[PDB]
């Protein structure tokens, strides 16, 4: 059946914005997972999980009688898809159970892992999400095997369809670099936003880069991909050596014995895949990655044997029974237990990427430190495991349950607690009047509050206006934020704050974070008044100001907008057309297509464009909140053409005289070209739509101003 | 960006179920189009349309100074995509403005027509939908040119994204038949559910079949396609000759001068397409179809000149300036006006398909009667034009406005008015108790009500339980409906009805249509009580009983279910897997994925299967409303394998003993295989889900019972 995508494969896709509809969600539109989880008997769940560890099922028998390794890999892979560039992937939505991730090569036989969990899932029902369950199971695996975790939070709601994530352009699983859709160019530079070296891998290739078994070059891939997952050297070595203290790999026979991945399998497979024709197809005969490595002398118990082995032997290149490159300890005795036959032992073995931890000079220093000081290794791995599995959870306010660590961590972008009375409605009116009396314009007010709040992304729940990090490094210097203009606004607002706060008693004060948002709201009110309309913009106080020392500057860099169509901004020239970038930004902001439409048309007329650009400013009453953008954009009296200077800038001329009326970018004119966008534009550009436009704009404005407000959730 | 459809192109697609979300809809969730429309000043709209017909715009100058022909074609094409097989296509949702239809070759330059109506759309805003406006404009065109229409109804609500329709499997526009994705097999048999001869055409190829200019063979294609759009020979002749009384075709130069269709055009084209490099690219130089025919001596006035020409001349094969086959009148004078130069006249011309009306012997009889009796032609055309443009609107209750024709037409599947008081809540309770005391079983009651209500399709709003047409031909004899079992149930309910109606005072009575539905309600309550749950199923009275004489039996044929996965029924063997057919049915019933899931699981356990099949009956308490389908399907203790007899039937055996526990079909087991459906199944198969399951099943049941209740809208 030929589809629109087949006929026009490069047309913009709006379906990513209409995901997560109440249509596909089985739960009622009033279901609140947080509340369900808070009533869960978490202790009960953990006791059932501990039991499960050694309750071997015959359709996938437990290695060493203990599923803990398999479950730690499951949990690590759930979290391991995370990319800092967009915040997409990670464990927070349980996406491992949907396509494509349920069928990625690197996720082979994790289908078995999840199926082993169904009875517990079933027993507790909606009070524990799959998303939470996959992480909790990893934690209980660790504790069962003797490692004490740093903590655990619930609160990851399940999702009901696949997220639309860009995982790469290759059309072959696992394709090596340099092909027609290569994710690499130049000197092994991985294209943003990807965080894996091959399509269907988690970070890197366990045999080495494009399968070349060189631990030194593998290290480079490890460092790059782990950094793109928010992990530094110390955390990376802790994670890899900590993980590989447990369990084993599976490569008992040739890979050609393994059949269709789950999304490809027949209906009879009932959601499982990778059925193997090799011997019994499971247990002692399992084939997962094709490698056949067991790292330690006690694979079901926490130990210090990983680094004892890594440093205590020299390593020889060899092949598994499936033909994969791996390493065996020269001259060792058979000290490693077999997973199923007590009469068999094996020599110590390692992956290429394990050896990275010794042969890369920076990892080697850490690895040696961890070898000499195992309590430092344990603590580091505990903290990194917590980080890994909670990285995409958002502000600490979303953390649920009795095991949430009290320690505030820098990577959490912490917001101080509020310890004083908040402003009330009379205070908010007084502040808004002070802001309007200062001279700050509608454009400056809207611009600033937009800059502050629109850093939020729903993918990992980072960013937003809470924290007033816009006044700190690096946000205060981002080009999109207009640093010299922003400085002038902030100085004025900081002076209003100081003067208000100085006049109060009883402890009441206003945060700068709140005042930036309130000032934005005053701008939008003033803009409606310029248009002749009375309007009230909702405002909720309670943001606090974070410090520079609570703001990791390098971690904040990934939130910098290099494209923000809502301010007609593009930092440079990209392969991806700008209207694609606009929809991606709308998805991050959690906007529907109608919300994106109304918001952009109103920001254009309010003066929110970077640099005061006239592109898309289709109004003769700038700073007035009107539907002018849509009425003018849709006027057939104007003809558009690209400029000779720049194919991405368009001039709109009167069709009868030739005279120039407007200029616009691709982001502006896609609203008059895409047949779904134009249908939305028509609604707001109709003669009966002025009040609808204003009301819808205020609602979306407020939505954006509250995106990170999980303290009100 | 590689997608799940790329990796697994044959996996089932659930996205068709979650179209029409409130996410993509810009109107508020309380917007009611009927209420907006009823206050429109329709007369004012029609005056503006009248004025528009002769107000030429220079970017697409009006032929003969009059847009009427263009607008008639626009409206004809809006309606003309309708297929009786599934009810999809048609004018009722305004889909011509979206992909793919907006860029079908047969829709070339209708982009211009729609753009001409923006100023009126803009003026009246949400009070007139685009869907309604396209058809209204065709009517105003006709009236302006001296044709008296049969009437007009408003009430087609706009849609905001493309419908997912199967339009064919060709990957090339206009591909001739006999290609690798040919829609023809055997002796020119067009595959169901298609209703056009080539991808991107409305009915037939105006040059002749696959371009062969033979009017006799063209007539075969005309008859077959028009029959598949619910039109008989008289209506077909009347429509084609009626339409081609007006206007002209456009083929002034070679087709290679025509550029990209709207969906492929540059952003600067602002949603228009087919920009032509031929001379001025428009007006006298226009190219649309490539044919260059003007049918009558007065292209802007109703006449009987089409048949005067068709029959008054002999015809010669010729070529347009674009190279297309067309016909010209042998030895004629230049009597046809030129569209822009009053000093030029042309000989009469015809398409191959126009000549069909004379050279096919059955058409010729009708055409000659219409020639001799033009008043009969005008009445036929007016009736056909109303049917064409309203065929997908649904019951007469949805018809809005002051121009609705009072004559009730047979193709409307009309329902008689109710002229008596309705039963009240106590009456309904008394009747449910009478039904349960009769000895009718849960299975009989559920199955009968299902059979009655589940004929509805939201594509054209035909079917449903209103009418009690289940007791009439042909419904009473459909295989799916289990004719002998059904007859026994109906006899018992008719006796209950008679006894209740006979006891009343005051004119109160219950229709059989209502009692079928209510009795199904009693069955579902009784099933719930069998499971230990007291529930009340909602019921709304007001259905009426239609007569056999008010039921067109041949039109009702297309509503027969040949696949109904909700009753585990497949009338024969199809190319399309049964699960795909299930999702198609769910879409026709307007069900979401969660609604389809709950509905199916509950019907299985209530005994709704055709023929009392055990397939999918995963319960040991049949006729009790429980979640047993889901709990048993999802039990990893059971292993499934296709049977040697039949690859589409599966046995479920205990994994340990081999013992046979169940059998199922693809429709049953897809809920354990597809990753999104299994996630839905898991929610209802959880230990906490019994109350939820009941509540949700009752809700979806009542939704189905009420699909055709636009009297309560
Ligand atoms: C450079 C990064 C890493 C690479 C290339 C890698 C590679 C792999 C491979 C290929 C397997 C074998 C899959 C099989 O055949 O069953 C595996 C097993 C596993 N990995 Fe990793 N790993 C990485 C980092 C991690 C991390 C960060 C963790 C957790 C903190 C982890 C924990 C595990 C464990 C527990 C297993 C054993 C599975 C079982 O016993 O069934 N690894 N690893
Ligand atoms: C066998 C069925 C049909 C065939 C093959 C067909 C073919 C076409 C073609 C090829 C054109 C020219 C497009 C252009 O170049 O501008 C057209 C024009 C037109 N058709 Fe049809 N037609 C059919 C039925 C109908 C029907 C049922 C109606 C309405 C009742 C209709 C009304 C018109 C009108 C009014 C025009 C003139 C458009 C203008 O003046 O711009 N046609 N026909
Ligand atoms: Cl994601
Ligand atoms: Cl449709
Ligand atoms: Na994420
Ligand atoms: Na339809």
CA–CA distances in Å: residue B337 to residues A315, B81, B300, B350: 93, 31, 11, 15
Task: Kindly list the residues from chain B whose CB atom is less than 8 angstroms away from the CB atom of residue A673.
Answer: 265, 267-271
| Complete DSSP assignment for A601-634 | HHHHHHT-SGGG--TT---SSTTS--SHHHHHHT
Does residue B25 contact residue B113 with C-beta atoms inside 8 Å? Answer: no
* Helix, strand, coil fractions of chain A, as percent rounded to 5: 45, 10, 45
Count CA atoms within 13 Å of residue B708 on its CB side: 28
Q: Note the residue count of chain A.
A: 713
B457 lines ligand 2 (CB under 6 A): no
Four-residue CA torsion sign, A110, A111, A116, A121: positive
Tell me how far apart the alpha carbons of residues A332 and A312 are, in angstroms, rounded to a whole number.
10
Based on the number of CB atoms within 10 Å of its own CB, is B669 exposed (0-12), middle (13-18) or buried (19 or more)? Answer: buried
SS3 B401: coil
As a CATH number, domain B168-372 is 1.10.420.10
Structure tokens at A131: 């998303």
Does residue B64 contact residue B299 with C-beta atoms inside 8 Å? Answer: yes
Q: How many angstroms separate the CA of residue B378 from the nearest CA in chain A?
A: 36
Does residue A99 contact residue B11 with C-beta atoms inside 8 Å? Answer: yes
Which residues pair with residue A400 across a beta bridge?
Answer: A154
Task: Kindly list the residues from chain A whose CB atom is less than 8 angstroms away from the CB atom of residue B1.
Answer: 166, 168-169
Q: Which CATH number fits domain B1-167+373-407: 1.10.520.10, 3.40.50.300, 3.90.1580.10, 1.25.40.10?
A: 1.10.520.10
Which residues pair with residue B190 across a beta bridge?
Answer: B184
Q: Is B77 a catalytic residue?
A: yes
Q: How many angstroms separate the CA of residue B472 from the nearest CA in chain A?
A: 36
Task: Kindly list the residues from chain B whose CB atom is less than 8 angstroms away from the CB atom of residue A675.
Answer: 97-99, 102, 262-263, 271
Query: Angle formed by the axes of helices A361-372 and A305-312, to 10°?
Result: 130
B48-64 as b/e: b if 16+ CB within 10 A:
ebeebbeebbebbbbbb
User: Following CA atoms A15, A18, A19, A20 in sequence, which dihedral angle do they give, to the nearest 10 degrees?
Assistant: 180
Resolution (A): 1.8
Q: How many angstroms separate the CA of residue A174 from the nearest CA in chain B?
A: 13
Which residues pair with residue A665 across a beta bridge?
Answer: A649
Does residue B460 contact residue B391 with C-beta atoms inside 8 Å? Answer: yes
Instruction: Determine, for residues B689 and A125 on separate chains, whether the beta-carbon distance falls below 8 Å.
Output: yes
Residue with token string 């495991």: A385
Tell me how far apart the alpha carbons of residues A252 and B310 are, in angstroms, rounded to a whole number.
80
Q: Which CATH class is domain A565-688?
A: mainly alpha
Tell me how far apart the alpha carbons of residues B458 and A387 are, in angstroms, rounded to a whole number.
49
Which of B60, B73, B200 is the pocket-test mutation for ligand 2 (most atoms within 8 Å of CB)?
B73
Element holding B223 (H helix, E strand): helix B215-227
Tell me how far apart the alpha carbons of residues B272 and B97 are, in angstroms, rounded to a whole number.
11
Q: How many angstroms separate the CA of residue B473 from the nearest CA in chain A?
A: 34
Task: Kindly list the residues from chain B whose CB atom is less than 8 angstroms away from the CB atom of residue A266.
Answer: 642, 673
Which of B65, B72, B291 is the pocket-test mutation for ligand 2 (most atoms within 8 Å of CB)?
B72
CA–CA distances in Å: residue A428 to residues A425, A518, A625, A658: 5, 7, 21, 49
Number of H helices and E strands in chain A, helices first, is 24, 12
B203 lines ligand 2 (CB under 6 A): yes
Tell me how far apart the alpha carbons of residues B414 and B467 are, in angstroms, rounded to a whole number.
8
Does residue B20 contact residue B107 with C-beta atoms inside 8 Å? Answer: no
B288 lines ligand 2 (CB under 6 A): yes
Please, where in chain B does CATH 1.10.520.10 lie? 1-167+373-407, 408-564+689-713
Residue with token string 């490692």: A147
- The Cβ of residue B65 has, within 10 Å, a number of other Cβ atoms equal to 13
SS3 A497: helix
CATH architecture for residues B408-564+689-713: Orthogonal Bundle (1.10)
Structure tokens at B368: 């000659």
Structure tokens at B592: 């979401």
Q: Which of B79, B221, B87 is nearest to B558 (CA)?
A: B87
Among the bound ligands, the one closest to the CA of A84: 5
Tell me how far apart the alpha carbons of residues B674 and A700 are, in angstroms, rounded to a whole number.
36
Does residue B225 contact residue B196 with C-beta atoms inside 8 Å? Answer: yes
Residue spans of alpha helices (H) in B261-417: 305-312, 352-359, 361-372, 374-390
Tell me how far apart the alpha carbons of residues B568 and B579 are, in angstroms, rounded to a whole number.
10
Q: Which of A487, A469, A486 is nearest to A551 (CA)?
A: A469
CA–CA distances in Å: residue B178 to residues A362, A696, B169, B190, B197: 66, 52, 12, 11, 11
Long-range contacts of A675-678 (CB under 8 A, 24+ apart): A675/B97, A675/B98, A675/B99, A675/B102, A675/B262, A675/B263, A675/B271, A676/A14, A676/A593, A676/B24, A676/B98, A676/B160, A676/B161, A676/B162, A677/A12, A677/A14, A677/A593, A677/A597, A678/A634, A678/B271
**Widest CA span in chain B:** 94
Phi and psi torsions of A393, nearest 5°:
-85, -20
**Closest residue of chain A to B7, computed from CA coordinates:** A171
Instruction: Determine, for residues B676 and A98 on separate chains, whether the beta-carbon distance falls below 8 Å.
Output: yes
Nearest CB partner across the interface for B18, out of A21, A103, A689? A21
Count CA atoms within 13 Å of residue A248 on its CB side: 32
Number of H helices and E strands in chain B, helices first, is 24, 12
Does residue A208 contact residue A352 with C-beta atoms inside 8 Å? Answer: yes
Q: How many angstroms separate the CA of residue B14 from the nearest CA in chain A?
A: 9
Task: Kindly list the residues from chain B whose CB atom is less than 8 angstroms away from the CB atom of residue A270.
Answer: 640, 669, 672-673
Experimental method: X-ray
Q: Which of B225, B709, B228, B226 is nearest to B461 (CA)?
A: B709
Phi and psi torsions of B189, nearest 5°:
-95, 120
Contacts of B556 (CB under 8 A, 6+ apart): B413, B469, B474, B475
B568: phi > 0 → left, psi -120 to 50 → alpha, else beta; which? left
Residue spans of alpha helices (H) in A391-473: 425-437, 442-453
Instruction: Determine, for residues A5 and B5 on separate chains, whether the beta-carbon distance falls below 8 Å.
Output: yes
Contacts of B357 (CB under 8 A, 6+ apart): B219, B237, B240, B241, B310, B363, B364, B366, B367
User: Does the annotation flag B420 for ligand binding?
Assistant: no
Nearest CB partner across the interface for B683, out of A26, A103, A666? A26
Measured in Å, residue B244 CA sits from the centre of ligand 2 at 6
Q: Testing the interface with A: which of B55, B117, B122 to mutate, by most A Cβ within 10 A?
A: B122
**Closest residue of chain B to A576, computed from CA coordinates:** B1
**Which of A77, A346, A615, A674 is flagged as catalytic?**
A77
State the SS3 of B439-481.
CCCHHHHHHHHHHHHCCCECCCCECCCCECHHHCCCHHHCHHH
Q: Which of B566, B649, B571, B567 is nearest to B609 (CA)?
A: B567
CB pairs < 8 Å spanning A and B: 245
Q: Which of B417, B486, B476, B462 is nearest to B555 (CA)?
A: B462
Sheet strands side by side (includes A349-350): A315-319, A325-329, A349-350
Which residues pair with residue B185 across a beta bridge?
Answer: B189
**Which of B77, B250, B390, B533 is flagged as catalytic?**
B77
A66 lines ligand 1 (CB under 6 A): no
Residue spans of alpha helices (H) in A228-360: 233-243, 305-312, 352-359
Instruction: Determine, for residues B673 and A269 on separate chains, whether the beta-carbon distance falls below 8 Å.
Output: yes
Tell me how far apart the alpha carbons of residues B571 and B587 are, in angstroms, rounded to a whole number.
19
Please, where in chain A does CATH 1.10.420.10 lie? 168-372, 565-688
Structure tokens at B432: 């449910």
Q: Which of B177, B593, B95 is nearest to A4 (CA)?
A: B95
B381: phi > 0 → left, psi -120 to 50 → alpha, else beta; which? alpha
Pairing between β-strand A336-337 and β-strand A184-185 as defined by DSSP bridges: unpaired
Does residue B278 contact residue B254 with C-beta atoms inside 8 Å? Answer: yes
User: For A234-305, where are the E strands, in sequence order?
Assistant: none
Tell me how far apart the alpha carbons of residues A633 and A407 are, in angstroms, rounded to a whole number.
53
Q: Taking the CA atoms of chain A, what radius of gyration do you get in angstroms?
A: 28
Element holding A368 (H helix, E strand): helix A361-372
- The Cβ of residue B151 has, within 10 Å, a number of other Cβ atoms equal to 16
Tell me how far apart the alpha carbons of residues A606 and A526 are, in angstroms, rounded to a whole number.
10
Which of B243, B339, B380, B385 is the pocket-test mutation for ligand 2 (most atoms within 8 Å of CB)?
B243
Measured in Å, residue B186 CA sits from the centre of ligand 2 at 29
Neighbours of ion ligand 6 (CB under 5 A): B 88, 90, 392, 459-460
Tell me how far apart the alpha carbons of residues B607 and B449 are, in angstroms, rounded to a whole number.
12
Among the bound ligands, the one closest to the CA of A159: 3
Q: Which of A595, A676, A597, A23 is nearest to B161 (CA)?
A: A676
SS3 A638: strand
Contacts of B648 (CB under 8 A, 6+ apart): B578, B642, B665, B666
Tell me how far apart the alpha carbons of residues A55 and A484 are, in angstroms, rounded to a whole number.
64
Structure tokens at A442: 């509608």
Task: Kindly list the residues from chain A whose CB atom is less than 8 angstroms away from the CB atom of residue B636.
Answer: 57, 59, 115, 118-119
Nearest CB partner across the interface for B268, out of A170, A641, A686? A641
């Amino acid at each position: 059946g030929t589809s629109n995508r087949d006929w026009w494969p490069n047309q913009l896709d709006l379906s990513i914005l209409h995901r997560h509809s109440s249509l596909s969600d089985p739960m009622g539109k009033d279901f609140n997972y947080a509340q369900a989880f808070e009533k869960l008997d978490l202790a009960a769940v953990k006791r059932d999980l501990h039991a499960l560890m050694t309750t071997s099922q015959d359709w996938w028998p437990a290695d060493f009688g203990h599923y803990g390794g398999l479950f730690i890999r499951m949990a690590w892979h759930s979290a391991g898809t995370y990319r800092t560039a967009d915040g997409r992937g990670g464990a927070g939505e349980g996406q491992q159970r949907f396509a494509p991730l349920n069928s990625w090569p690197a996720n082979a036989n994790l289908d078995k892992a999840r199926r082993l969990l169904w009875p517990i899932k079933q027993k507790y029902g909606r009070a524990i999400s799959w998303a939470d369950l996959l992480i909790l199971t990893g934690n209980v695996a660790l504790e069962s095997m003797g490692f004490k975790t740093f903590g655990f939070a619930g609160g990851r709601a399940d999702t009901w369809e696949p997220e639309d994530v860009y995982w790469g352009s290759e059309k072959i699983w696992l394709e090596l670099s340099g092909g027609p859709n290569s994710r690499y160019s130049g000197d092994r530079q991985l294209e943003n936003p990807l965080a894996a070296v091959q399509m269907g891998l988690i970070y890197v290739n366990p045999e080495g880069p494009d399968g070349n078994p060189d631990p030194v070059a593998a290290a480079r891939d490890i460092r790059d991909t782990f950094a793109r997952m928010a992990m530094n050297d110390e955390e990376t070595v802790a994670l890899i050596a900590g993980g590989h203290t447990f369990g084993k790999t599976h490569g008992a026979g040739p890979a050609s014995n393994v059949g269709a991945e789950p999304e490809a399998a027949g209906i009879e497979a009932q959601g499982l895949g990778w059925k193997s024709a090799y011997r019994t197809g499971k247990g002692a005969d399992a084939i997962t990655s094709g490698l056949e490595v067991t790292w330690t002398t006690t694979p079901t118990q926490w130990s210090h044997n990983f680094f004892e082995n890594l440093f205590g032997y020299e390593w020889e290149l060899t092949k598994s029974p499936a033909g994969a490159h791996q390493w065996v300890a020269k001259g060792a005795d058979a000290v490693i237990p077999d997973a199923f036959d007590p009469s068999k032992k094996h020599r110590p073995t390692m992956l290429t990427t394990d050896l990275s931890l010794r042969f890369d000079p920076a990892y080697e220093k850490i690895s040696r430190r961890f070898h000499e000081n195992p309590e430092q290794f344990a603590d580091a791995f505990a903290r990194a495991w917590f980080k890994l599995t909670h990285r995409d959870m958002g502000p600490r306010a979303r953390y649920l349950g009795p095991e949430v660590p009290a320690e505030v961590l820098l990577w959490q972008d912490p917001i101080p607690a509020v310890d004083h009375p908040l402003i009330d409605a009379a205070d908010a009116a007084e502040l808004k009047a002070k802001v309007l009396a200062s001279g700050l314009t509608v454009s400056q007010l809207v611009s600033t509050a937009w800059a502050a709040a629109s850093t939020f992304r729903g993918s990992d729940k980072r960013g937003g206006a809470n924290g007033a990090r816009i006044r700190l490094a690096p946000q205060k210097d981002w080009e999109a934020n207009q640093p010299e203009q922003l400085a002038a606004v902030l100085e004025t607002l900081e002076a209003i704050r100081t003067a208000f706060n100085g006049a109060q008693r009883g402890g009441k004060q206003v945060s700068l974070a709140d005042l930036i948002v309130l000032a934005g709201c005053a701008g939008v009110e003033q803009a409606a008044k310029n248009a002749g309309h009375a309007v009230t913009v909702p405002f909720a106080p309670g943001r606090a100001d974070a410090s520079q020392e609570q703001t990791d500057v390098e971690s904040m860099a990934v939130l910098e907008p290099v494209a923000d169509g809502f301010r007609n901004y593009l930092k440079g020239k990209y392969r991806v057309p700008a209207e694609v970038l606009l929809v991606d930004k709308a998805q991050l902001l959690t906007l529907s297509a109608p919300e994106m439409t109304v918001l952009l048309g109103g920001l254009r007329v309010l003066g929110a464009n970077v640099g005061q650009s006239r592109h898309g400013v289709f109004t003769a009453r700038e700073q007035a909140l009107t539907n002018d953008f849509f009425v003018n954009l849709l006027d057939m009296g104007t003809e558009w053409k690209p400029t000779a200077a720049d194919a991405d800038v368009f001039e709109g001329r009167d069709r009868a005289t030739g005279e120039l009326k407007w200029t616009g970018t691709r982001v502006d004119l896609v609203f008059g070209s895409h047949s779904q966008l134009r249908a939305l534009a028509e609604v707001y550009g109709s003669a009966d739509a002025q009040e609808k436009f204003v009301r819808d704009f205020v609602a979306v404005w407020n939505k954006v101003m509250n995106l990170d407000r999980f303290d009100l959730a």
